Curated annotation (Swiss-Prot):
Monomer. This is Photoactive yellow protein. The modification S-(4-hydroxycinnamyl)cysteine is found at C69. PROSITE patterns: PAS (PS50112). It comes from Halorhodospira halophila. It comes from the Bacteria. The gene is pyp. GO terms for molecular function: identical protein binding; photoreceptor activity. Keywords: Chromophore, Photoreceptor protein, Receptor, Sensory transduction.
Length: 125
């Protein structure tokens, strides 16, 4: 395992050192998005939660293509305000229900330490 707790205050500094292989050792799902919502990184734990194959969703748009259930003011709306503002740090519960059994999760969205990238972290509840 990589030992990093979900919700940790300095998580963006810790994850700045990991490559795709290290990200697969986290105890929670991790997605890195660009400012348009395209998927740059997608770890093994996220694929275990949602059924998606990580290598197949990299490059797709999360809000348009992969996760239309998140295209709502409650999820995408928060993301886009964060990108526009250049700051984002929010945690909320959500249900993922597209082409899968409805699954309740906790989501943490946080701006990355690098400029135009954003993390989405997911764990079951
Ligand atoms: C709603 O459409 C949610 C879909 C979804 C969430 C998270 C993922 O990693 C993949 C699909």
């Amino acid at each position: 395992m990589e030992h990093v707790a979900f919700g940790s205050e300095d998580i963006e500094n810790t994850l700045a050192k990991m490559d795709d292989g290290q990200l697969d050792g986290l105890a929670f799902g991790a997605i890195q998005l660009d400012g348009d919502g395209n998927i740059l990184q997608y770890n093994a734990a996220e694929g275990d939660i949602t059924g998606r194959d990580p290598k197949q969703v990299i490059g797709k748009n999360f809000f348009k293509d992969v996760a239309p259930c998140t295209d709502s003011p409650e999820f995408y709306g928060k993301f886009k305000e964060g990108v526009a503002s250049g700051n984002l740090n929010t945690m909320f519960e959500y249900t993922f229900d597209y082409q899968m059994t409805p699954t309740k999760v906790k989501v943490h969205m946080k701006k990355a330490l690098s400029g135009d990238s954003y993390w989405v972290f997911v764990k079951r509840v």
